[PDB]
Amino acid sequence: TSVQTSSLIQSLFDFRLAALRIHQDSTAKNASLINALVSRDSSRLDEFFSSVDELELSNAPDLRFISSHDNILWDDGNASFYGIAQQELNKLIRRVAISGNWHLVQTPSEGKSVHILMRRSSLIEATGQVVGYLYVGIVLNDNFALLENIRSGSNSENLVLAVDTTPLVSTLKGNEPYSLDYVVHSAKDDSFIVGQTFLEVESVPTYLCVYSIQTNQNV
Structure with missing residues (x-):
């Protein structure tokens, strides 16, 4: 999903x-x-x-x-x-x-x-x-x-809006098993799954990337 x-x-x-x-x-x-x-x-x-x-x-x-x-x-x-x-x-x-x-x-x-x-x-x-x-x-x-x-x-568990590699804002509190830095240089789809979504503005591709971190529920 x-x-x-x-x-x-x-x-x-x-x-x-x-x-x-x-x-x-x-x-x-x-x-x-x-x-x-x-x-x-x-x-x-x-x-x-x-x-x-x-x-x-x-x-x-x-x-x-x-x-x-x-x-x-x-x-x-x-x-x-x-x-x-x-x-x-x-x-x-x-x-x-x-x-x-x-x-x-x-x-x-x-x-x-x-x-x-x-x-x-x-x-x-x-x-x-x-x-x-x-x-x-x-x-x-x-x-x-x-x-x-x-x-x-x-x-979502946590999200981070970045202009790629560079975070604009995040929801992480500082107690997560993962750092902001990790989340930002992490592969797209592990214990903590990291989603990547490039936002569209007026149906047009944009460089704004929203990372969504979901913990592998298997666990």
């Missing part, structure tokens, strides 16, 4: 991205927002999002920022928490320039390329002129909540 665990993992991953896409695409049509943006006052924008999130938490993106062309109008400010220079968002804007589709992008951040999944929705005016684009993103590095979600949803 290898391909089964792998597809399970992929559906769980697909599920999370879906939760965000839907929430994004809806906020992108929230007159309250559109008008708070055209109003040109960062407060309603801040408040708008703080309220948006006040109850849909954990289903909230890690990064969020509105922008018209290269002119970033508003930013939730979480970019800095990730060690991402307001500058490094402008380059991501061009990189993700194809609305309604998720993009796996990298970005420099204090000596470690940070891997992010991004997507943009256009903010139209109730007049029909596009007024900007809302950019939403999920940071993969150290995103334990995302990996833990997928681990329990698939009832």
Whole structure:
């Protein structure tokens, strides 16, 4: 049941991205927002999002920022928490320039390329002129909540998300019979079976590899 665990993992991953896409695409049509943006006052924008999130938490993106062309109008400010220079968002804007589709992008951040999944929705005016684009993103590095979600949803023993040989995040606690290092340089299919699943983003192959460790139940 290898391909089964792998597809399970992929559906769980697909599920999370879906939760965000839907929430994004809806906020992108929230007159309250559109008008708070055209109003040109960062407060309603801040408040708008703080309220948006006040109850849909954990289903909230890690990064969020509105922008018209290269002119970033508003930013939730979480970019800095990730060690991402307001500058490094402008380059991501061009990189993700194809609305309604998720993009796996990298970005420099204090000596470690940070891997992010991004997507943009256009903010139209109730007049029909596009007024900007809302950019939403999920940071993969150290995103334990995302990996833990997928681990329990698939009832996996442990999981580790790596950009091959290099771990982005793990569920291991440090008491397992196996080390993170082992899990990462281990053969695909032993006492501890180690599965390997390359995630697809929008049905497209990706270098994101999720390792699933299952203990040989024989034992």
